[PDB]
Write a protein that holds these residues in place. Sequence first.
Motif, PDB file in Angstrom:
ATOM      1  N   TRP A  45       0.808  -1.220   0.000  1.00  0.00           N
ATOM      2  CA  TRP A  45       0.000   0.000   0.000  1.00  0.00           C
ATOM      3  C   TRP A  45       0.840   1.269   0.000  1.00  0.00           C
ATOM      4  O   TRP A  45       0.256   2.372   0.005  1.00  0.00           O
ATOM      5  N   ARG A  46       2.176   1.176  -0.093  1.00  0.00           N
ATOM      6  CA  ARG A  46       3.054   2.314   0.174  1.00  0.00           C
ATOM      7  C   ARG A  46       2.819   3.468  -0.762  1.00  0.00           C
ATOM      8  O   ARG A  46       3.029   4.618  -0.384  1.00  0.00           O
ATOM      9  N   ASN A  47       2.416   3.198  -2.016  1.00  0.00           N
ATOM     10  CA  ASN A  47       2.220   4.263  -3.012  1.00  0.00           C
ATOM     11  C   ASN A  47       0.774   4.693  -3.136  1.00  0.00           C
ATOM     12  O   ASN A  47       0.482   5.620  -3.922  1.00  0.00           O
ATOM     13  N   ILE A  48      -0.108   4.026  -2.412  1.00  0.00           N
ATOM     14  CA  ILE A  48      -1.534   4.348  -2.393  1.00  0.00           C
ATOM     15  C   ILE A  48      -1.873   5.241  -1.215  1.00  0.00           C
ATOM     16  O   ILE A  48      -2.551   6.276  -1.380  1.00  0.00           O
ATOM     17  N   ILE A  49      -1.317   4.913  -0.049  1.00  0.00           N
ATOM     18  CA  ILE A  49      -1.556   5.661   1.189  1.00  0.00           C
ATOM     19  C   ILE A  49      -1.281   7.153   1.028  1.00  0.00           C
ATOM     20  O   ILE A  49      -2.102   7.963   1.482  1.00  0.00           O
ATOM     21  N   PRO A  50      -0.231   7.606   0.353  1.00  0.00           N
ATOM     22  CA  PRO A  50       0.017   9.049   0.282  1.00  0.00           C
ATOM     23  C   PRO A  50      -1.064   9.837  -0.434  1.00  0.00           C
ATOM     24  O   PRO A  50      -1.161  11.052  -0.261  1.00  0.00           O
ATOM     25  N   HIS A  51      -1.889   9.193  -1.275  1.00  0.00           N
ATOM     26  CA  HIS A  51      -3.022   9.882  -1.873  1.00  0.00           C
ATOM     27  C   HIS A  51      -4.168  10.085  -0.896  1.00  0.00           C
ATOM     28  O   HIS A  51      -4.977  11.003  -1.130  1.00  0.00           O
ATOM     29  N   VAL A  52      -4.278   9.247   0.127  1.00  0.00           N
ATOM     30  CA  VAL A  52      -5.406   9.258   1.048  1.00  0.00           C
ATOM     31  C   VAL A  52      -5.089  10.052   2.319  1.00  0.00           C
ATOM     32  O   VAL A  52      -5.939  10.772   2.853  1.00  0.00           O
ATOM     33  N   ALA A  53      -3.840   9.949   2.813  1.00  0.00           N
ATOM     34  CA  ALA A  53      -3.366  10.603   4.029  1.00  0.00           C
ATOM     35  C   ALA A  53      -3.662  12.091   4.086  1.00  0.00           C
ATOM     36  O   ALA A  53      -3.837  12.614   5.188  1.00  0.00           O
ATOM     37  N   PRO A  54      -3.653  12.860   2.987  1.00  0.00           N
ATOM     38  CA  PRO A  54      -3.971  14.278   3.128  1.00  0.00           C
ATOM     39  C   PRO A  54      -5.319  14.549   3.750  1.00  0.00           C
ATOM     40  O   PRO A  54      -5.521  15.655   4.311  1.00  0.00           O
ATOM     41  N   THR A  55      -6.299  13.678   3.565  1.00  0.00           N
ATOM     42  CA  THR A  55      -7.638  13.918   4.070  1.00  0.00           C
ATOM     43  C   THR A  55      -8.078  12.950   5.154  1.00  0.00           C
ATOM     44  O   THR A  55      -8.986  13.293   5.914  1.00  0.00           O
ATOM     45  N   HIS A  56      -7.486  11.752   5.260  1.00  0.00           N
ATOM     46  CA  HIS A  56      -7.988  10.732   6.178  1.00  0.00           C
ATOM     47  C   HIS A  56      -6.849   9.984   6.826  1.00  0.00           C
ATOM     48  O   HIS A  56      -5.796   9.767   6.207  1.00  0.00           O
ATOM     49  N   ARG A  57      -7.085   9.606   8.073  1.00  0.00           N
ATOM     50  CA  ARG A  57      -6.166   8.700   8.737  1.00  0.00           C
ATOM     51  C   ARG A  57      -6.087   7.401   7.950  1.00  0.00           C
ATOM     52  O   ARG A  57      -7.111   6.867   7.500  1.00  0.00           O
ATOM     53  N   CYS A  58      -4.873   6.885   7.786  1.00  0.00           N
ATOM     54  CA  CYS A  58      -4.586   5.602   7.130  1.00  0.00           C
ATOM     55  C   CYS A  58      -3.898   4.671   8.087  1.00  0.00           C
ATOM     56  O   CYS A  58      -2.873   5.041   8.692  1.00  0.00           O
ATOM     57  N   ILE A  59      -4.482   3.490   8.230  1.00  0.00           N
ATOM     58  CA  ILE A  59      -3.958   2.443   9.126  1.00  0.00           C
ATOM     59  C   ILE A  59      -3.729   1.232   8.246  1.00  0.00           C
ATOM     60  O   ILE A  59      -4.670   0.758   7.593  1.00  0.00           O
ATOM     61  N   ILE A 279      -5.350   3.995  -8.239  1.00  0.00           N
ATOM     62  CA  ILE A 279      -6.023   3.445  -7.071  1.00  0.00           C
ATOM     63  C   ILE A 279      -6.122   4.474  -5.943  1.00  0.00           C
ATOM     64  O   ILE A 279      -7.208   4.757  -5.417  1.00  0.00           O
ATOM     65  N   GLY A 280      -4.996   5.089  -5.578  1.00  0.00           N
ATOM     66  CA  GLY A 280      -5.023   6.025  -4.456  1.00  0.00           C
ATOM     67  C   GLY A 280      -5.812   7.283  -4.780  1.00  0.00           C
ATOM     68  O   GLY A 280      -6.594   7.753  -3.952  1.00  0.00           O
ATOM     69  N   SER A 281      -5.654   7.830  -5.978  1.00  0.00           N
ATOM     70  CA  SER A 281      -6.372   9.065  -6.287  1.00  0.00           C
ATOM     71  C   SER A 281      -7.878   8.829  -6.354  1.00  0.00           C
ATOM     72  O   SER A 281      -8.669   9.684  -5.943  1.00  0.00           O
ATOM     73  N   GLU A 282      -8.320   7.675  -6.866  1.00  0.00           N
ATOM     74  CA  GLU A 282      -9.750   7.415  -6.944  1.00  0.00           C
ATOM     75  C   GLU A 282     -10.320   7.067  -5.590  1.00  0.00           C
ATOM     76  O   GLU A 282     -11.433   7.491  -5.285  1.00  0.00           O
ATOM     77  N   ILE A 283      -9.574   6.400  -4.702  1.00  0.00           N
ATOM     78  CA  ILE A 283     -10.067   6.249  -3.347  1.00  0.00           C
ATOM     79  C   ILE A 283     -10.259   7.634  -2.735  1.00  0.00           C
ATOM     80  O   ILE A 283     -11.307   7.911  -2.128  1.00  0.00           O
ATOM     81  N   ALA A 284      -9.260   8.511  -2.897  1.00  0.00           N
ATOM     82  CA  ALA A 284      -9.351   9.831  -2.264  1.00  0.00           C
ATOM     83  C   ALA A 284     -10.570  10.582  -2.772  1.00  0.00           C
ATOM     84  O   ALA A 284     -11.245  11.273  -2.000  1.00  0.00           O
ATOM     85  N   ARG A 285     -10.873  10.482  -4.077  1.00  0.00           N
ATOM     86  CA  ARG A 285     -12.017  11.207  -4.638  1.00  0.00           C
ATOM     87  C   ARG A 285     -13.340  10.646  -4.128  1.00  0.00           C
ATOM     88  O   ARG A 285     -14.338  11.378  -4.030  1.00  0.00           O
ATOM     89  N   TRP A 286     -13.389   9.348  -3.834  1.00  0.00           N
ATOM     90  CA  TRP A 286     -14.618   8.661  -3.428  1.00  0.00           C
ATOM     91  C   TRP A 286     -14.907   8.823  -1.942  1.00  0.00           C
ATOM     92  O   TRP A 286     -16.083   8.795  -1.537  1.00  0.00           O
ATOM     93  N   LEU A 287     -13.894   9.026  -1.110  1.00  0.00           N
ATOM     94  CA  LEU A 287     -14.130   9.096   0.342  1.00  0.00           C
ATOM     95  C   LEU A 287     -15.096  10.198   0.788  1.00  0.00           C
ATOM     96  O   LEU A 287     -15.908   9.938   1.695  1.00  0.00           O
ATOM     97  N   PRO A 288     -15.051  11.430   0.251  1.00  0.00           N
ATOM     98  CA  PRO A 288     -15.923  12.492   0.800  1.00  0.00           C
ATOM     99  C   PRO A 288     -17.389  12.138   0.809  1.00  0.00           C
ATOM    100  O   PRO A 288     -18.094  12.494   1.772  1.00  0.00           O
ATOM    101  N   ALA A 289     -17.867  11.436  -0.208  1.00  0.00           N
ATOM    102  CA  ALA A 289     -19.283  11.065  -0.322  1.00  0.00           C
ATOM    103  C   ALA A 289     -19.725   9.967   0.642  1.00  0.00           C
ATOM    104  O   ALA A 289     -20.936   9.758   0.799  1.00  0.00           O
ATOM    105  N   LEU A 290     -18.822   9.289   1.285  1.00  0.00           N
ATOM    106  CA  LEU A 290     -19.224   8.354   2.349  1.00  0.00           C
ATOM    107  C   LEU A 290     -19.914   9.099   3.577  1.00  0.00           C
ATOM    108  O   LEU A 290     -20.214   8.465   4.591  1.00  0.00           O
ATOM    109  N   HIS A 291     -20.193  10.394   3.409  1.00  0.00           N
ATOM    110  CA  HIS A 291     -20.593  11.322   4.478  1.00  0.00           C
ATOM    111  C   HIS A 291     -19.662  11.208   5.678  1.00  0.00           C
ATOM    112  O   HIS A 291     -18.579  11.794   5.686  1.00  0.00           O
TER     113      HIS A 291
END
Length: 291
Positions: A45-59, A279-291
């Motif tokens: 996940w090393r190259n995916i997490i940096p797309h998500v970390a700006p907005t959400h905690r990643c574990i 993968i990482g950029s599309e996860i990041a785009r999809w997260l906001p709509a999860l309310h």
Amino acid sequence: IGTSFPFDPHYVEVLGSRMHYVDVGPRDGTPVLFLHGNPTSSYLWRNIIPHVAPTHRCIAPDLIGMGKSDKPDLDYRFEDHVRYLDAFIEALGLEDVVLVIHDWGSALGFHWARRNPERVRGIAFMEFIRPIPTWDEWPEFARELFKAFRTPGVGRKMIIEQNMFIEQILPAFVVRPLTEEEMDHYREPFLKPEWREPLWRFPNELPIAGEPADVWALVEAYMRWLHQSPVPKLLFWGEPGVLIPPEEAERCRESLPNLKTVFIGPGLHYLQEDNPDEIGSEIARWLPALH
Ligand SMILES: [Cl-]
Ligand SMILES: [Mg+2]
Ligand SMILES: [Mg+2]
Ligand SMILES: [Mg+2]
Ligand SMILES: [Mg+2]
């Protein structure tokens, strides 16, 4: 595609063993829990997490006996992994989560979601485990190797003595050539043959032709749940794919509720190594709509 693993190690005690995890991103909001499978670790996940970390905690934990996690004397059956991941999630105090899952990480994640449906805000998945009724329906590429992995004696020589899950399956299931640096990160937890039990037990747990019966029943149960759950779902798929070729992505589009799909280009099984940025950029785009 980066080869470094620039994440500070975190450890938590889980059922008597230390488990390693990545933990980055903001300290509030819903956390995104990344679950790798066989024979990988949080490194996948090393190259995916940096797309998500700006907005959400990643574990991103390393499953028991894998990565930088401890090596207890287990059988490393699916049921062992279920116990250690359940205890990892509780030890971190996680309440609601978004799951990002792959391979045996997907069996773990979907099983946890079926049992804890109120706590799952979305599931992103790729190249996931479902029951395969016959060998003829198992993916042809590397099929004879998987048959041999599940053959008494033969499979242990291949996986434990020869390290074939690391040295053969993993690079064969990435379209682009993995570099020696990347291979050394994947090799590190398994340098001694006595550390390779999880790598052999996993293919022996795959739900094929009803066996093993306990995993088969649990995977059938989470697939029934997935087909009825309103949870937001995001499927990444590549071509030709391994478990999820294009015709299977189509069947998912036609059957699963509340699904978005994202084509990542060329890919086999470890899609994260072929196109982590999509993968990482599309996860990041999809997260906001999860309310
Ligand atoms: Cl496996
Ligand atoms: Mg200890
Ligand atoms: Mg920290
Ligand atoms: Mg260690
Ligand atoms: Mg490309």
